[PDB]
């Protein structure tokens, strides 16, 4: 599942162009090995960019988001939609905000419930979990999803 | 030895309701024979109703164990 | 001409069981009827829709 | 730097502390309240509601109270060169106690109980109960 | 027609000669078929098959709760070769050669 | 006033264990309610099912005590 | 006796503690 | 032994590997008249059979009593 | 209480932060519900061929639908 | 009860 | 000669288990209230049920002690 | 005929020892239903199996009580 | 009659059991106060209620001990 | 030989610890099936192993008891 | 006579039970203090109240161990 | 001649206590398996070592019991 | 002085019970120190206070042992 | 006549208690390993040290029992 | 040597109880080490102090055993 973050207004330079470029690269790389790809997006620009070429892969799209500031349209909603539509591997494409004249496009490989269940999580044994790990993991993972989207979209904005 | 164990369990589950209906009944009958006033009788009516509910509970338990002990695959 | 209505059996079994059944029926009169009639209502609905 | 406790207490809308050096910090874990200081073990905990209580090294006696709704706490041991031990308290909504009210609190409690009186859905019942919890905590914590 | 829920059940079945045969098949020729409207349906068929396999497995398989696996000193072919993989190989290379 | 009283008294030592079991039962019901109130009627139900054994056992012991007090 | 009527309305009744008066 | 009086069956595992096993029909239908009833659709029962069946619409409490 | 009710921790946290924001003082409460209004427009697809489009201005109806 | 690569005497 | 007193004192000893059960029950109540302070009436109700059972057993053992003492 | 009664009264201790254990089993059932209400069945089956075991032990001790009481 | 000393002392064991129960209940209150130090009052209330019942039981055990002593 | 009957009773008192053990075991089993249900096949197996021991011990506690009741 | 010493011994058993309860109660204090030091001297006061009640119970047990020693 | 028999009965009771400990070990292992399935083999081995030691103690008790039945 | 010897042995039993109670304190101390070492000294203080009480009880019962072994 | 045998049996009961104590050790082991395998060897070493102390105490008890048997 | 042997056996029972109490402490040690290895030696210290009480009491017990074996 490829979550592509973008805007809804134009005159944004070529940031959505680079986003859709990275998304096309990822899709064409992951469809060779045979991984079935689904596409989630934020903004009409990614939709207009990938309709004709990858419109047979759309799953769910959100728009009219940044009419207001960001956490108006809470990332929690999108994260809940992803978990309800739980994929086996998730990627997030966005623009990192280095400085006022420089950005950078990135892809975040994000952990999913399948990838958590296939690991014993021995790396977190150094940490004390006040509720038990098995009971707090499912509530921590949704927070992780939400926070991931949040910072990524702030940087993209 | 397994046959003896099984028959013991089966007979206990079969007589459990009979016990709840008979021996606790005898106890209630003693109390009825001994009590005379109205306050104690008012309070004892609720014990009798509790015995009703308890009997139905024991009957449910026995039904469960008997359908477990008389269920055959083939 | 008997002691039937003055019996330990009466006061221990007949009046408690009967009164409990009566109280439960009075309190759950409608719950029971609805739980029973659910299936019949659904079947009648299905039949009418198929016919239509 | 120093052998202090570097607190960062943060909500999405406002970061109240970033590298504040303190002595002791009390926090309302999901099981119960507990107090983190320097030397405390690496731990993670989920929070339920109530009044975080911060105590600076310059203060010692003087305090700072902040109400938290929900979130997490992450206590990380001190790096060998930093000499100082760090802690991160993340809250989905972190208000001070000065900005709280008991009247609108009780009104919202009343309206929550009114909405949940028609108890049909599991999420509605759960939301009513959790709102009761948080609003009781707000009432008990406000001045 | 009248409403079918007003109609008497035995009268309906006397009128209908086809579903008579459907009832005889499952409730006269058998005594253990479920009292469902459609016992021949795929859910019932597959449930019966899975029950069959689970019953036979529980009865015959070597397990921690063994029914039939008991008093074993001379094993049969399948269990012997399942427990002794060294002998299955040797007995098999000899057979092919 | 002989051995029958002693036996009927020694029979009563089980009521302590029965009371500990009942206490554990209802403490578990209390904890489960405090955790997830929305299944109260279930926990209570199972608790009553448990009592359907525990009470019965205690009552047995009491009866056998009287049987040894008037054997 | 047979249940006559052309109606498909599943109708049940609740009773009162009063008798019919004509 | 010769093999004449051998076991007249094959184990279910070997049948399953052969693709031969059937699981169903705890009951059976002996006669073809009884087998083809649900497929005929027009005469599931002959007329004689129909009138013979009409005699058993209800159980006989009189015969039970006697 | 949420994995049993079929609810996410993010949903619960948001729906509780809403009540907390309702328990605020009016000058800060105005800015809080200001900075925390909602406006989204979900658009569901199935190999193209839009199944539905729907707007959301409330947190509870956004998480429900 | 558990398969092994060793065969005993009686099962030789 | 004083065997009835021995029997009474031996029958009394179930008060220990009864009190252990009561303590465990009310401890569960207090803990569940420290966790969920908004739910106290239901927890108290179940605690009262358990206390009724336990006090019933305790008064039973005391009554039987009095019986064996003054038979 | 006093030692038989005392032997039976002494054998009745396992009833109280078993009520503890039934209490713990049903407490575990309650806690499991509070932690995962989606699984009501598949917990009650194991509960009934273990309870059956402890019921068998109770039957054993009561049977041996009656045995020593008449033999 | 020194024999009744034995009986009285035997009765005193219940005091030990009651003490264990009281300790468990107080421990629960102490932990509850630590977990939710905001209230500290509604927990002490139920603590006193339980200590009421447990002290009552201890008092009647002591009284029965003295009774079997003097008689 | 009444002391035989006493010894037997004492030899049966051990069921009180046996059943307790079994209870704890099955309690943990239920907790596991409520925590990580998808591995019942493991937990039940381990439980059966434990029962295969506990059963055996209890059988000994019966057998020797009967031996001391006859010899 | 010397038989009174056995009464004293039983009283000592009661003292052991109260000791067990006292230790259990202290553990909760230790844990609640390690979890939440900020409220230390409150937990101390609550423990002090419980400790005094337990101490009185122990003192009573000792007094009876003297009274059924000298009489 | 039953004085040896009582000793044997006491040994059996000790065996029961050992059985209770074994059950506790099994319960802990099941809980551990539920929490950390991938590490079962190590946990199982540790449990096996504990079980062997406990079994050895139990056998020792049974042996001494047999000896005390005759010598 | 055989009765005296028995009374002293029972006193020893009380000492063993006291030790069992003492274990709780150091277990709670170890857990609290594993959690928050920064509250070491305070915890040590509370620990020694409780140990003082337990020690007092032990000394008392030992003294009673000596008394009932000579006087 | 068989007082020494009775003493040996009592010692055996003590051994059973020691076994019960061991069970908690190995439960904590099988739990701390589930909670942190990377330090499991250290945990195992600590558990072994504790087990050795418990075994040493049991051996000492057995030696005492033999001495008691042989007067 | 009857009475003396019985007294020694009772002392042995006390020692077994002490071992049971020790087990809890070493289990707490294992858990604390699992959760916070960095203060392992500072836990070990406290456990040794715990032994410095517990074992010391045990020593007293055994010494008194020998004294009442040759008093
Ligand atoms: C004290 C008991 C003694 C025996 C021990 C009991 C053993 C049997 C237990 C049975 C228990 C079943 C429960 C009762 C059944 C209830 C429902 C029912 O029967 O449906 C109606 C049903 C009516 O049938 P229908 O479906 O309406 O068919 C009517 C047709 O139109 C009719 O037309 P048709 O074409 O069918 O034929 C006409 C005619 C004749 O048939 C013909 O077509 C002509 C051919 C007839 C010639 C040959 C006659 C048969 C053999 C000789 C019989 C008599 C004497 C034998 C002498 C030996 C040689 C000299 O039909 C018959 O004669 C019917 C045969 C009756 C046999 C019973 C039914 C079989 C049930 C299986 C019982 C199992 C026994 C094992 C068998 C033995 C081992 C293999 O009733 C019966 O016919 C059966 C009678 C039941 C027997 C009475 C037993 C008492 C039951 C007590 C229950 C109450 C419990 C509590 C008591 C306390 C009360 C306060
Ligand atoms: C796999 C198989 C499983 C089998 C499970 C078996 C377990 C259940 C066995 C219980 C049998 C007990 C019933 C007989 C006892 C009553 C006798 C009697 O009727 O007295 C005459 C009664 C009482 O009459 P009366 O009291 O007014 O006056 C006459 C009384 N005599 C004659 C006795 C003096 O006659 C009636 O009028 C009865 C009418 C009311 C209906 C009574 C039935 C309800 C009560 C019993 C239900 C028990 C079944 C519960 C099932 C629960 C399962 C989920
Ligand atoms: C098959 C057994 C299981 C099913 C139980 C069948 C019914 C149970 C019978 C009632 C139980 C109690 O029965 C009650 O105790 C005994 C029974 O003889 C009687 O008691 C009477 O006989 C006993 C003889 O042992 C005397 O010691 C006693 O002094 C005398 O009062 C009471 O009069 C009776 O009220």
Author numbering:
A (entry chain g1): 106 to 262
B (entry chain k): 151 to 224
C (entry chain b): 261 to 312
D (entry chain d1): 41 to 183
E (entry chain a): 148 to 244
F (entry chain O1), K (entry chain N1), L (entry chain P1), M (entry chain M1), N (entry chain Q1), O (entry chain L1), ...: 96 to 166
G (entry chain b): 83 to 104
H (entry chain c): 67 to 132
Give sentences from the paper.
F-type ATP synthases are energy-converting membrane protein complexes that synthesize adenosine triphosphate (ATP) from ADP and inorganic phosphate. These universal enzymes function by using the energy stored in an electrochemical potential across the bioenergetic membrane by rotary catalysis. In mitochondria, F1Fo ATP synthase resides in the crista membrane where it is known to form dimers, which can further assemble into rows critical for inducing the membrane curvature and maintaining membrane potential and morphology. Here, we investigate the mechanism for the generation of the unique cristae in the Apicomplexa, using a combination of single-particle cryo-EM, cryo-ET and subtomogram averaging.
We then performed solubilisation with n-dodecyl-β-D-maltoside (β–DDM) that resulted in dissociation of the hexamers into dimers. Refinement into a 2.9-Å resolution consensus map allowed model construction of the entire ATP synthase dimer. The 1.85-MDa complex consists of 32 different subunits, of which only 15 are canonical with structural equivalents in other phyla. The apicomplexan-conserved subunits and extensions of the canonical subunits constitute a membrane-embedded Fo subcomplex, which ties the two F1/c-ring subcomplexes together at the angle of 19°. The structure of the T. gondii ATP synthase reveals that the unusual architecture of the dimer is generated by the peripheral stalks that are laterally offset, extending away from the central dimer axis. This architecture does not allow the formation of the conventional dimerization interface of type-I ATP synthases found in animals and yeast, in which peripheral stalks extend along the dimer long axis. We therefore examined the dimerization interface, which is formed by the apicomplexan subunits and extensions of the canonical Fo subunits. Those elements involve eleven proteins from each monomer that contribute more than 7000 Å2 of buried surface area, making the interface substantially larger than in mammalian, yeast and algal ATP synthase structures.
